[PDB]
Design a protein around this ligand. Structure first.
Ligand SMILES: Nc1cccc2c1C(=O)N([C@H]1CCC(=O)NC1=O)C2=O
Ligand SMILES: [Zn+2]
Lengths: 1115, 379
């Protein structure tokens, strides 16, 4: 609506910068990584990297450089943000307390200035006299590094050369000297200048070189003793100094564009170079002291590197924007100099498209992204839950139950897993990680076990259909056996350390565990068949209550012991009988859970002495019946719920919560505290027994499905249990006439189809990827020069089939505007993709949306609506000619939101009685727009330049027809990220609505709506938090969030920053009361009483529950 | 045909106006989105585009004294793009800043001749008439929307050093320009070819090919803003399309709109007749340095946006050729009327000397033509 809450669900993963130095101490070697708005600080260790501190800034890090001014014990850090906020930071640590303090700060933006084409360049001279900033054409800003320059005051030196490509400060010079590559009418050249510190002007530099390579783009300052500079172009690498000139152009770099570099050693005898394709090179300066020649060696392949940094021990950090980041080892006499991958780091960006699987389910929905580009392209399956580290797998099918057990009374650790099967029981012994099937004396393999385990007096119990068997630990024999008076088989079995409550049809029986004897104490008949029983002591191993579920009554009731007196009777409702029942305590407060035959779970409070339901609550846990099992996590007790959707039930603020398990269908479970598997669990499905350890806490589980090509669009087709993915791959023209660069998803599919029988070419495909295995089941190749643009998965008209529909465009280098394209309707039946129908359009099909059982498509500047007929053809119903290109298309009801690349918003309405569209409203505001979404019938969200969000609303006032057709700008916010996709979807099961967004940096965020009362409270809260929260670099949050373009800056409105709001939980108790001091809390009556810290702790806590939680950085 | 014995710089000088005029070089610009109150000239009916020159001849004492007091101030007046000429209704307009001025008081007849240039677009808040008869408009300055590159936001920092390309000498050059400038399109939802449709440089080059057909004998501006306004003042479009063009705030949308008009509107018809064809776009040529169409004032202070074409059809010629007040020195004019409806379409221009080229041409007034697409704006 008009009031929105925007919060981060996954911080940016893409790496834009990486530096090494000595930040945390003079003795430590650090690795500083910039991930947009975040700075991660690691300590390089012989084994690997150790995370020490991660900070967020109210800015997009544009420059990050470590430096050591004279008199300083360890390095300082210079950061410059995209909004020209400059700062010098220092790492301060007192024991286990870490702060990043601002030594100096200030905004270095100029009132006038044309921002340079090769962007912001920030360089520091070797002597640390100054910071040199190339922000605008014709100017070189200089910030002296004097101790007293705490406001980073600077001066500009006019540069005659207007088009500078790259600049660096040289080494071994008599005064701060810059070296740069520039272009002018006579070509590309290299020039140097001295910075006169007294004059604050440029002086004639030591050397220059006119007419360098047309493509030279990188300046490398070589340190002493040689000094000078290295220039890297497209086909050549050259060295320059006052007198010397070296030039190489080796074939090894002929087909590479080098875009990054790093100095390996302090003498600068070796450099690492990375091209746009993942090749890693080593540039060596060969001495004879003097510098004699240059040599390039191809080391191997890494991820496409944005930045490289040599660490130590031949370990290189590869910072990537298009694929996962890495730690590679350079190995690098016998072999050539080569590289081996050591560690990989998840990078979800760029997220070019995404979709939600299980959106309808309350929570438990996975997000699938089209991530990366080129050889780094992949799908990323993102789900939140508790993971299980599997340690062992046993192929043993048909398991109907698992029980932990201790065959040795002198040991406290379990050493036996007993499993039941239909009409059978097997015993497995554990000797460390060695599982070996054995026989247990006194236990029968003849019958199916309903319960078994350790009981009182150093004994074991085994409850089968035939009988109840007491077994001695030392002698391993059946000391006592209880059987039904008429030999009738048991139907339900419950037991604890000293009590056994067996159910024989409708009649319950209460046996008591005694030394070498099972004493039958009580025998009663219930008014319905017994479906589930429980006697968990909540006591000295004795529970005076018994939970029992019934068939005819369909109720879960709590009875007294040993009197069988009904203390309460609660009717569950419906026609399915219960499956499991459990009495358990969460955070000293008792409960009574009840699982139904249709995966429905009921949870009520249970009075230990009274025996009655406190609150009738229900939570659907799946389709399959649920089996509840108690287990201990730490001091407290948790319950594992086995079904098609396994769940862990726990307490939080004395209230039940339901974290889902990052696992598939689990039928049975039991805790296992073996010597080889301590504090572990056993899980059983239809065919396997798994022994694993459940993770500490809920985190994101990301499955990477590499495609080795670029995924462009994704749709989910539930009926087919698969994904439709538009993808492209680059091929190079071959002599024997085009060919692939490497195998990828579209060339490695199980089955494939085609649309017809040295420069690059894009081959477009439709992949059908299985949703469980992720194998490429099929690949369809589009026509030569045909660009696949849009994709939907839907049912049309009266047709029951679900189709994959693709909108294409014919792309010819000679034609600027697309004049040809088509809509192809595909069906994935059995194992193949069939083309059902095709529709030629006279333009590009930029977008497609299923619209009320019809296909709404935007072709060029028009919006067309198609009907799917019984002859299985798309027949044109109506058209809407827009004065804009219909790039974006979103619909809600009969409304259509149409948008172009320049932020032109058009609102249309399908008139069913007229058979055409009517323009409702519009808004022209030229700015680059990257995505749009409909929030509700009246409000529209969009992402516009530069990294902003905006909300426009159709007018409430309705004064006149002109006011009715004009959209009002009600929200603006500088997000700091570039949104590629918006989609409605549930993350976790006040606020209304959920809109997720995917970005270029791999960040995933959420936009939800607020009431005016909530927005006004949180807006006040932000202004009070902005006075409490310390900002790295002393940047005002309001300046950071202000809507921004190079030309304009307006304050944010209509948006609440959830990342700032949630930081309230991390501030001190006294500071919390300063924040909430004059806040007006509204409980739901208008009576705005004063807000307390506890009111806002509960308010901000439920806000954290609407999105995925962020992981702690440091160990 | 070629231009011979005719100085193409002569028409932009407006020598028919008279002797040398005092020139003013100071420049007044009002803040973006600011509210200014600027005087409107009463009988001016033209729709002015920024950068476009407007010659005027004022004879009424209230107009003469209004410009006299305008010279002593910011030299700016408001030119309204009338939505209703009869109802005197206007929603938009352009300021015109006087750059040249001359007074004539020969025979006791005061005449003020001015040359003004369009500066800034605005939105009309209100129109109030003054005691002197001069309307005064309260206007809100519309800002020129300047956008960076489409890629400036999603651009990888490592490929920043590749954003300067070697000098343009070629279809192969444009293929390489697109592939390198829009390489980071791979991080977004759209292809490089889409980003080309919104690239000022590519759009100006597309226009430049068709503008070269009109003026076969590279003086156009480099700034997309200046180029789009220079092209806007040359398109012979009807008043309804010209007001839509003026309403555009971005040079990208303006260049895109101009390319659509140039690719669709290829036949010029009589506005009164509507379906009667006067000339085709193939006949349009630039006799003036400013292009194929410029504003010129007649002896009675009436402004005509005259378009020069090689041949015009379906016109009848009335009167005898006259060189009086001729906007093309060396040519005589003859009134041309539509043969069907007799509406004044423009004039036939005949050369007075046999050594001139072209020996004949047509000057068609913009207000008389209707551009048809032989079988609304588009940005
Ligand atoms: N002498 C008169 C008298 C009435 C109308 C006009 C002229 C006249 O000269 N022009 C045009 C004709 C065409 C031209 O070259 N210059 C003009 O001022 C008129 O519209
Ligand atoms: Zn006519």
């Amino acid at each position: 609506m008009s009031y929105n809450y925007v919060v981060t669900a996954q911080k940016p993963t893409a790496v834009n910068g990486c530096v090494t130095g000595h930040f945390t101490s003079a003795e430590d070697l650090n690795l500083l990584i910039a991930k947009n708005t975040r700075l991660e600080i690691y300590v390089v260790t012989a084994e690997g990297l150790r995370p020490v501190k991660e900070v967020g800034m109210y800015g997009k890090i544009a420059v990050m450089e470590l430096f050591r001014p004279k008199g300083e014990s360890k390095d300082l850090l210079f950061i410059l943000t995209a909004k020209y906020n400059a700062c010098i930071l220092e790492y301060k640590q007192s024991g286990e307390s870490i702060d990043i303090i601002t030594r100096a700060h200030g905004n270095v933006q100029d009132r006038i200035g044309r921002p340079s084409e090769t962007g912001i360049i920030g360089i520091i001279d070797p002597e640390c006299r100054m910071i040199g900033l190339r922000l605008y054409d014709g100017l070189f800003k200089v910030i002296p590094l004097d101790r007293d320059n705490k406001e980073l005051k600077a001066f500009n030196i006019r540069l005659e050369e207007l088009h500078v490509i790259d600049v660096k400060f040289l080494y071994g010079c008599q005064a701060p000297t810059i070296c740069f590559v520039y272009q002018d009418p006579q070509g590309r050249h290299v020039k140097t200048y001295e910075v006169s510190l007294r004059e604050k002007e440029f002086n004639k530099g030591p050397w220059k070189q006119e007419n360098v390579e047309a493509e030279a783009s990188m300046v490398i300052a070589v340190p002493e003793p040689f000094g000078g500079a290295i220039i890297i172009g497209q086909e050549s690498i050259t060295y320059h100094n006052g007198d010397k000139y070296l030039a190489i152009a080796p074939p090894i770099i002929k087909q590479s564009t080098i875009v990054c570099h790093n100095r390996v050693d302090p003498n600068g005898s070796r450099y690492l170079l990375g091209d746009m394709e993942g090749r890693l090179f080593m540039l060596l300066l060969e001495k004879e002291v003097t510098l004699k020649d240059l040599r390039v060696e191809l080391l191997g392949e890494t991820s496409i590197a944005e930045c490289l940094t040599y660490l130590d021990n031949g370990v290189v950090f590869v910072g990537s924007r298009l694929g996962d980041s890495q730690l590679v080892k350079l190995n690098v006499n016998e072999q050539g100099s080569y590289v081996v991958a050591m560690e990989t780091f998840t990078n979800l960006g760029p997220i070019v498209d995404m979709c939600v699987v299980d959106l309808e389910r309350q929570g438990q929905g996975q997000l699938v992204t089209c991530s990366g580009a080129f050889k780094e392209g992949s799908l990323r399956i993102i789900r939140n839950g508790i993971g299980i580290h599997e340690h062992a797998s046993i192929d043993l099918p048909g398991i109907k139950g698992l029980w932990p057990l201790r065959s040795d009374p002198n040991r406290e650790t379990d050493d036996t897993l007993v499993l039941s099967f239909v009409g059978q029981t097997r015993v497995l012994m554990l000797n460390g990680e060695e599982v070996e099937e054995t026989e247990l004396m006194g236990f029968v393999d003849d019958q199916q076990t309903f319960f078994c385990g350790n009981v009182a007096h150093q004994q074991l119990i085994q409850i089968t259909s035939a009988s109840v068997r007491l077994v001695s630990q030392e002698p391993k024999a059946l000391v006592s056996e209880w059987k039904e008076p008429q030999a009738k088989n048991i139907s339900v079995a419950s037991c604890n350390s000293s009590q056994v409550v067996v159910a024989v049809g409708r009649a319950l029986y209460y046996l008591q565990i005694h030394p070498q004897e099972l004493r039958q104490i009580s025998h009663t008949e219930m008014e319905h068949e017994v479906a589930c029983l429980d006697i968990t002591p909540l006591s000295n191993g004795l529970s005076p209550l018994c939970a029992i579920g019934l068939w005819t009554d369909i109720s879960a009731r709590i009875l007294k012991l040993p009197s069988f007196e009904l203390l309460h009777k609660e009717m569950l409702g419906g026609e399915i009988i219960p499956r499991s029942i459990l009495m358990t305590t969460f955070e000293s407060s008792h409960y009574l859970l009840c699982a139904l035959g249709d995966g429905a779970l009921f949870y009520f409070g249970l009075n230990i002495e009274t025996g009655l339901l406190s609150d009738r609550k229900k939570v659907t846990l799946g389709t399959q019946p649920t089996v509840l099992r108690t287990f201990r996590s730490l001091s407290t007790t948790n319950v594992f719920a086995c079904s098609d959707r396994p769940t862990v039930i726990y307490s939080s603020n004395h209230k039940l919560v339901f974290s889902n398990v990052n696992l598939k269908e689990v039928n049975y479970m039991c805790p296992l505290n073996s010597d080889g598997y301590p504090d572990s669990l056993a899980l059983a499905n239809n065919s396997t027994l798994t022994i694993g350890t459940i993770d500490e806490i809920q985190k994101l589980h990301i499955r990477t499905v590499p495609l080795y090509e670029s995924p462009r669009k994704i749709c989910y087709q539930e009926v087919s249990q698969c994904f439709g993915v538009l993808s492209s791959r680059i091929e190079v023209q071959d002599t024997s006439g085009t060919t692939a660069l490497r195998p990828s998803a579209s060339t490695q599919a199980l089955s494939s189809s085609v649309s017809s029988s040295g420069e690059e070419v894009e081959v477009h495909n439709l992949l059908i990827i299985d949703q469980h295995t992720f194998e490429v089941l099929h690949a369809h190749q589009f026509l030569q020069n045909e660009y696949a643009l849009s994709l939907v998965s839907c049912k049309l008209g009266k047709d029951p089939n679900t189709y994959f529909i693709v909108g294409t465009a014919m792309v010819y280098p000679e034609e600027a505007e697309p004049k040809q394209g088509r809509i192809v309707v595909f069906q994935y039946s059995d194992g193949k993709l069939q083309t059902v129908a095709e529709k030629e359009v006279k333009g590009a099909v930029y977008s497609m949306v299923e619209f009320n059982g019809k296909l709404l498509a935007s072709i060029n500047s028009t919006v067309r609506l198609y009907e799917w007929t019984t002859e299985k053809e798309l027949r044109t119903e109506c058209n809407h000619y827009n004065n804009i290109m219909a790039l974006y298309l979103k619909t809600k009801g009969d409304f259509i939101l149409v948008g172009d690349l320049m932020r032109s918003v058009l609102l249309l309405a399908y008139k069913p009685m007229e058979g055409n569209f009517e323009e409702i409203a519009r808004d022209f505001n030229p700015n680059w727009m990257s995505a749009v979404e409909i929030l509700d019938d009246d409000n529209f969200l969009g992402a516009e330049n530069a990294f902003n969000l905006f909300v426009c609303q159709k007018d409430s006032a309705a004064t006149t027809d002109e006011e009715r057709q004009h959209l009002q700008e009600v929200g603006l916010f500088h997000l700091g990220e570039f949104v590629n996709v918006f989609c409605h979807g549930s993350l976790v099961m006040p606020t209304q609505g959920s809109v997720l967004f995917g970005t270029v940096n791999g960040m995933i965020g959420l936009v939800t709506s607020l009431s005016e009362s909530w927005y006004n409270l949180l807006l006040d809260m932000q202004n009070r938090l902005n006075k409490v929260i310390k900002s790295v670099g002393k940047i005002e949050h309001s300046f950071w969030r202000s809507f921004h373009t190079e030309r304009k800056t307006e304050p944010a409105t209509g948006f609440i920053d959830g990342d700032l709001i949630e930081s309230f939980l991390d501030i001190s108790r006294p500071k919390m009361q300063e924040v909430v001091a004059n806040l007006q809390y509204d409980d739901g009556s208008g009576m705005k009483r004063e807000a307390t810290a506890d009111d806002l702790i509960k308010v901000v806590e439920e806000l954290t529950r609407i999105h995925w939680s962020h992981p702690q950085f440091e160990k | 045909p070629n231009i011979i014995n005719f100085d193409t710089s002569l028409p932009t000088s407006h020598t028919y106006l008279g002797a040398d005029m005092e020139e003013f070089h100071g420049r007044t610009l009002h803040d973006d989105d600011s509210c200014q109150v600027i005087p409107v000239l009463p009988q001016v009916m033209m729709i002015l585009i920024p950068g476009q020159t407007l010659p005027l001849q004022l004879f009424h004492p209230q107009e003469v004294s209004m410009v006299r007091n305008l010279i002593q101030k910011d030299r700016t007046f408001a030119v309204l793009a009338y939505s209703n000429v009869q109802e005197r209704e206007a929603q938009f307009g352009t300021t015109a800043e006087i750059y040249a001025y001359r007074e004539e008081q020969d025979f006791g007849i005061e005449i003020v001749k001015v040359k003004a240039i369009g500066r800034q677009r605005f939105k009309v808040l209100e129109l109030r008439t003054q005691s002197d008869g001069i309307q005064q408009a309260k206007v809100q300055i519309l800002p020129e929307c300047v956008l960076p590159s489409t890629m400036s936001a999603v651009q990888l920092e490592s490929l920043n050093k590749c954003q300067i390309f070697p000098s343009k000498p070629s279809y192969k050059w444009w293929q390489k320009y697109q592939k390198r400038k829009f390489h980071c399109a791979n991080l977004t939802s759209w292809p490089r070819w889409l980003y080309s449709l919104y690239d000022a440089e590519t759009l100006m080059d597309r226009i430049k090919k068709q503008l070269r057909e009109w003026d076969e004998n590279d003086s156009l501006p480099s700034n997309p803003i200046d180029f789009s306004y220079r092209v806007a003042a040359c398109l012979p479009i009807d008043d309804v399309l010209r007001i839509q063009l003026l309403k555009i705030g971005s040079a990208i949308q303006r260049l895109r709109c101009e390319l659509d008009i140039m690719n669709k509107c290829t036949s010029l018809c009589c506005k009164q007749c509507q379906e009667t064809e006067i000339t085709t776009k193939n006949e349009i040529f630039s006799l003036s340095l400013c292009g194929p169409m410029a504003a010129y004032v007649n002896p009675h202070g009436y402004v005509h946006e005259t378009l020069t074409v090689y041949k015009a059809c379906n016109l009848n010629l009335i009167g005898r050729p006259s060189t009086e007040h001729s906007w093309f020195p060396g040519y005589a004019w003859t009134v041309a009327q539509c043969k069907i409806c007799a509406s004044h379409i423009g004039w036939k221009f005949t050369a007075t000397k046999k050594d001139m080229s072209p020996q004949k041409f047509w000057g068609l007034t913009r207000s008389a033509l209707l551009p048809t697409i032989p079988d609304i704006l588009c940005l």
